[PDB]
Amino acid sequence: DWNFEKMGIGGLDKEFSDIFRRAFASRVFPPEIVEQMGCKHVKGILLYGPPGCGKTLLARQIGKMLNAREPKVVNGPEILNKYVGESEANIRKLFADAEEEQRRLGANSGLHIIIFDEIDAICKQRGSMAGSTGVHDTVVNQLLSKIDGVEQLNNILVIGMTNRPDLIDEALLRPGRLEVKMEIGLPDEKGRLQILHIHTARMRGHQLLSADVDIKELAVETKNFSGAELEGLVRAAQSTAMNRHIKASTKVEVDMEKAESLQVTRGDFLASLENDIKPAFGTNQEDYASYIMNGIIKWGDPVTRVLDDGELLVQQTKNSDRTPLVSVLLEGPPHSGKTALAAKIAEESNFPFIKICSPDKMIGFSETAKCQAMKKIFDDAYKSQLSCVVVDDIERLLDYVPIGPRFSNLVLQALLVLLKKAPPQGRKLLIIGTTSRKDVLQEMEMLNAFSTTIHVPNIATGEQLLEALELLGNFKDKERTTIAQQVKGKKVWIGIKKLLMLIEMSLQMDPEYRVRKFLALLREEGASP
Amino acid sequence: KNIDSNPYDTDKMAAEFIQQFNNQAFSVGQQLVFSFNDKLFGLLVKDIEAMDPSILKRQKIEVGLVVGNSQVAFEKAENSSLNLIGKAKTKENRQSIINPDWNFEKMGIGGLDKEFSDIFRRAFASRVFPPEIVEQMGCKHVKGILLYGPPGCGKTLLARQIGKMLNAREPKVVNGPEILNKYVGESEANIRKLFADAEEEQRRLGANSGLHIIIFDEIDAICKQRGSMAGSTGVHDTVVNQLLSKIDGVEQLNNILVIGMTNRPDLIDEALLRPGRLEVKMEIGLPDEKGRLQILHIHTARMRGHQLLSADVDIKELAVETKNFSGAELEGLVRAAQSTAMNRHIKASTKVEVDMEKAESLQVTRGDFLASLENDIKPAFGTNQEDYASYIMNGIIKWGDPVTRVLDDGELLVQQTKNSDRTPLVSVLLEGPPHSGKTALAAKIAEESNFPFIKICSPDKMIGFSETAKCQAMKKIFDDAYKSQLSCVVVDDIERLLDYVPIGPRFSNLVLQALLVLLKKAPPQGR
Numbered sequence A: 001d002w003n004f005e006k007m008g009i010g011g012l013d014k015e016f017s018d019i020f021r022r023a024f025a026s027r028v029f030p031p032e033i034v035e036q037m038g039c040k041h042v043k044g045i046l047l048y049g050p051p052g053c054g055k056t057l058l059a060r061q062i063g064k065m066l067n068a069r070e071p072k073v074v075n076g077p078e079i080l081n082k083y084v085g086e087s088e089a090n091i092r093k094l095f096a097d098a099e100e101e102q103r104r105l106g107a108n109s110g111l112h113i114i115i116f117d118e119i120d121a122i123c124k125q126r127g128s129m130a131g132s133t134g135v136h137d138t139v140v141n142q143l144l145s146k147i148d149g150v151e152q153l154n155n156i157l158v159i160g161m162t163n164r165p166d167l168i169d170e171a172l173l174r175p176g177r178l179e180v181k182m183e184i185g186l187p188d189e190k191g192r193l194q195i196l197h198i199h200t201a202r203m204r205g206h207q208l209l210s211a212d213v214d215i216k217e218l219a220v221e222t223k224n225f226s227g228a229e230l231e232g233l234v235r236a237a238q239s240t241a242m243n244r245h246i247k248a249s250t251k252v253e254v255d256m257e258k259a260e261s262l263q264v265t266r267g268d269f270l271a272s273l274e275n276d277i278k279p280a281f282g283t284n285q286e287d288y289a290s291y292i293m294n295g296i297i298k299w300g301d302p303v304t305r306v307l308d309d310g311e312l313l314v315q316q317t318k319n320s321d322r323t324p325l326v327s328v329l330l331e332g333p334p335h336s337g338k339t340a341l342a343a344k345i346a347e348e349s350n351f352p353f354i355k356i357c358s359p360d361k362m363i364g365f366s367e368t369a370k371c372q373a374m375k376k377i378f379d380d381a382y383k384s385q386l387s388c389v390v391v392d393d394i395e396r397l398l399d400y401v402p403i404g405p406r407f408s409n410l411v412l413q414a415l416l417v418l419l420k421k422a423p424p425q426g427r428k429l430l431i432i433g434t435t436s437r438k439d440v441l442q443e444m445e446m447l448n449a450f451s452t453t454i455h456v457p458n459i460a461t462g463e464q465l466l467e468a469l470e471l472l473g474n475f476k477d478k479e480r481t482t483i484a485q486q487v488k489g490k491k492v493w494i495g496i497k498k499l500l501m502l503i504e505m506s507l508q509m510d511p512e513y514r515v516r517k518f519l520a521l522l523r524e525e526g527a528s529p
Numbered sequence B: 001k002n003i004d005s006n007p008y009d010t011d012k013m014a015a016e017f018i019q020q021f022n023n024q025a026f027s028v029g030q031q032l033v034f035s036f037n038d039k040l041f042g043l044l045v046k047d048i049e050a051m052d053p054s055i056l057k058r059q060k061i062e063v064g065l066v067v068g069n070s071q072v073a074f075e076k077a078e079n080s081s082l083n084l085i086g087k088a089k090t091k092e093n094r095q096s097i098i099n100p101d102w103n104f105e106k107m108g109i110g111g112l113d114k115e116f117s118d119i120f121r122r123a124f125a126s127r128v129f130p131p132e133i134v135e136q137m138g139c140k141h142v143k144g145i146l147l148y149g150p151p152g153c154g155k156t157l158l159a160r161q162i163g164k165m166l167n168a169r170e171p172k173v174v175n176g177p178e179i180l181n182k183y184v185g186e187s188e189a190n191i192r193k194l195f196a197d198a199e200e201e202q203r204r205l206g207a208n209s210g211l212h213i214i215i216f217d218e219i220d221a222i223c224k225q226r227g228s229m230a231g232s233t234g235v236h237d238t239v240v241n242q243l244l245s246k247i248d249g250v251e252q253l254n255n256i257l258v259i260g261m262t263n264r265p266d267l268i269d270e271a272l273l274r275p276g277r278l279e280v281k282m283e284i285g286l287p288d289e290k291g292r293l294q295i296l297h298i299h300t301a302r303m304r305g306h307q308l309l310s311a312d313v314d315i316k317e318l319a320v321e322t323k324n325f326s327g328a329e330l331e332g333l334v335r336a337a338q339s340t341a342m343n344r345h346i347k348a349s350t351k352v353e354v355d356m357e358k359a360e361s362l363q364v365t366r367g368d369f370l371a372s373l374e375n376d377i378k379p380a381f382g383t384n385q386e387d388y389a390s391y392i393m394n395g396i397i398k399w400g401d402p403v404t405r406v407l408d409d410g411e412l413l414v415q416q417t418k419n420s421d422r423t424p425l426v427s428v429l430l431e432g433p434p435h436s437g438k439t440a441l442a443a444k445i446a447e448e449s450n451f452p453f454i455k456i457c458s459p460d461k462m463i464g465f466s467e468t469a470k471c472q473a474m475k476k477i478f479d480d481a482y483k484s485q486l487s488c489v490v491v492d493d494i495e496r497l498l499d500y501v502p503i504g505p506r507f508s509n510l511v512l513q514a515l516l517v518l519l520k521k522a523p524p525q526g527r
């Protein structure tokens, strides 16, 4: 039987299918033919995937599916990092029961399962990439010798677990030990629909769930939701709906007046979905809501062209089969409005995964820490069906300073490789960057890595300045006429950001001196190419 | 400018809307101006629906026509003070539920209302109902809470009050670094000697025992590896593994509840923040004016009962001269306002003797409060009186126009940074030739600013420091300024922080790449 909808696990049908078809087909056939052929039994499995997706449930379910003892448990950083001379004793103790049973009745016993949580720490000499590795080869050598060294056993089965699959030494994966490896992944719409159908099953049985609640629609509003957070959403909804019936006094007592009629309504689901349970591979209206701070105003031609090009790039990266990766670089003079446009372009992609790697959250970090943080941010984007990332103010990550010059050579070389890297098969990406010194990056050869570039200009005519002032709607018609009497017969040079500060400074004077001070200010800072 | 709280009849508003905009085209998202009772309002189109067929004979549309029999429903915008009455009010919003009515005065906490309600609704809403209905639903009670805020704002008191409200055993206590004790075999023994009572009670009484609160402290020392991601430092993390194994996993318990309290929310590993582990997260901040009033009104109740408080000592007034006063410093002020009052009625002659003739009339008076407010409690997140006291040395005397110009410009900037909403951050750089008086003309502007929080970061207190120490000190000083509704900060001799020396140059590139970043960082929100 493979009734994988009653055991408790949902959204994983092919994974268990393959795992059984290959590994555990010998332990289900009658022992007669199994002995006649002489086929040996697998004694190792490696599951790897993102954290909080349902890896332990599968382990316990596979253990129970074949009648066996209660699975043991271990932890990675626990067995290691204890008093010397005792870790080996613990490792030897781990298999004591299996060894005793084998010595007692030989080749006729029950499976003894183990679950080696977080295996990519102790059995890892590949710790030297940017910092340093640890001298702990004793543990890995002892484990390898025990599982299969110069001796063998037939009453064991080792299941590993890890969220970093590229930190495992090949010595622990040669055929004969830890052969079958599988990858668990984030569920899609059908997976979420199945998952939401199990965690709320007892409530529906006892007519304690209102008929308005819709699961089909609830399966379309949670995008890139991990498996373990639907449980959190359901629990939050249950808590919210049941808090109305706790009206009490100095000493809290249950409101027995209407203990019945305790019904959960769609409103509570929606409330818990908007205010609480913030996703892991889903982003919020916090990161891309502090960069944009005064909206976007159309003061001329450039805004429309830039937004149109952004939309074209997005629609290319969403409907192409031969260019899974696209990049674009924004540039312009300082105080021109580069950062405030990248966020606006990215916000309208309706992309499930959005993140912003800015330099203001890394203050005082060393080189290696910054490289590792950037690498982690990039790695957290290959796991979603389609994503989008932003890298703003590049020239303050490299630490460029005109004197010297002085850059950091360990960040540029990571940035180039990561910019030219392609994601796994089937997925897509889009990278946007903003910089204010185009003449410097060209020397470093970086510009040849970016697919395309766009130019963001400043205000360069009296008409555009007047239009911006009108749209901002601050000065009256008379003052606008007075200003136009001067600005029109000349040229201007001022970025959009500086205009807000100049207007704010000017507005604080007396009512009759709000124009002269502004005009005086525009002569010193502005109109100065 | 014309906002008012007077009620507005939606039925009349809808009738006037139809009477005016009849046979007119409207589209979703359209913005227009509507006049009602000589009052102007801004209208934004939200939903449009077609009519039903006539009697002789609710689709959504984007554009349509308005007629006499059309219906209009008015809803106030977000954070709108407009008062709307009548049946022409559609109610599609989100408000959760009506939390149980609370009486904070009896418990003894003031200024914390939303946080208390949220914590009770989330963590504890499922530990009050009988086990029957909870079992029928199927649930796994929350077993984790995290709190973080400035010291002395009433964090532990919340936990103790909530624990004593729900009949439960006396809470234990542990200290963060105290559990980091030399060698293994004692720290692990300490971890073991925390849940033995809980597990024994669970085994003895099954799934019917009482709650066992366990209050931590400085949880950012243990379970802290981000501290290694710095310019220096570095330490292996081993104790977090034991606590993680006990809290969740095999032999899990059903009558435990951890409560972690910290001070640096960003020095926490992601290991101890994922659903199933410490779930909820709340923050406690400095109290505001009404908070200070409520706090004071609670600590001076016993004296008022027995008629020990004079009639002229108003409590309302004292809530307007204490700005950015922490929670505990109000208790400190109240305590210090009594020693002075009661230190008068004591005579000593070869031995301290309690006075007898004037023992009665022992009443605390305004003088005690005023003296204590000026020379007793020294605030922490508040205005100093020594920093900008030794900088300006011999006053300021006019010698021409430039002094007037500089002072006027400073005043204009300091008023803009207080009556603006589109530019929360403004910075100005003074400069001139050496030996000209550009450090006694900034302290004067800061002192005339009148902002509650005024600090001065100067190189005089960083003699012999390396680069990392300077970075840490500057970061801490700047961070402290995000905890007040207004802040002014001064940097002196920027050339000295960078260590410039023209046999070179030999500047420091780890301080110049932080000073640039800091000067562009909008405060969290509305500060």
Ligand SMILES: Nc1ncnc2c1ncn2[C@@H]1O[C@H](COP(=O)(O)OP(=O)(O)OP(=O)(O)O)[C@@H](O)[C@H]1O
Residues within 6 Å of the ligand: A292, A293, A294, A295, A296, A297, A298, A299, A303, A333, A334, A335, A336, A337, A338, A339, A340, A341, A393, A436, A496, A497
């Ligand atoms: N059409 C517009 N284009 C760009 N910015 C605009 C526009 N209209 C208004 N703004 C405002 O301009 C500001 C641009 O952002 P910001 O001041 O951070 O510029 P920046 O180029 O990112 O700065 P810096 O060069 O210092 O990194 C934002 O406050 C945005 O509200």
Ligand SMILES: Nc1ncnc2c1ncn2[C@@H]1O[C@H](COP(=O)(O)OP(=O)(O)OP(=O)(O)O)[C@@H](O)[C@H]1O
Residues within 6 Å of the ligand: B392, B393, B394, B395, B396, B397, B398, B399, B403, B434, B435, B436, B437, B438, B439, B440, B441
């Ligand atoms: N504009 C001014 N008018 C009158 N007196 C002034 C003025 N500016 C400063 N003073 C006085 O002169 C002295 C100024 O000394 P201060 O330490 O400020 O020197 P400085 O040249 O600004 O310093 P530094 O060389 O470190 O930049 C103080 O006594 C101050 O009272």
Ligand SMILES: Nc1ncnc2c1ncn2[C@@H]1O[C@H](COP(=O)(O)OP(=O)(O)O)[C@@H](O)[C@H]1O
Residues within 6 Å of the ligand: A008, A009, A010, A011, A050, A051, A052, A053, A054, A055, A056, A057, A195, A227, A228, A231, B276
């Ligand atoms: N695919 C899934 N279906 C149903 N429940 C799940 C699933 N994945 C996780 N859960 C729930 O999450 C809880 C913890 O998940 P766990 O297996 O510890 O995640 P991880 O494998 O990352 O450690 C389990 O008790 C289980 O009920």
Ligand SMILES: Nc1ncnc2c1ncn2[C@@H]1O[C@H](COP(=O)(O)OP(=O)(O)O)[C@@H](O)[C@H]1O
Residues within 6 Å of the ligand: B108, B109, B110, B111, B112, B150, B151, B152, B153, B154, B155, B156, B157, B295, B298, B327, B328, B331
């Ligand atoms: N909101 C508050 N209401 C009443 N008293 C408070 C409040 N906050 C702090 N206090 C007072 O401060 C004293 C100590 O507070 P404490 O719990 O040590 O603060 P922290 O949580 O920062 O350690 C208590 O005796 C308490 O009376």
Ligand SMILES: [Mg+2]
Residues within 6 Å of the ligand: B439, B492, B493
């Ligand atoms: Mg000086």
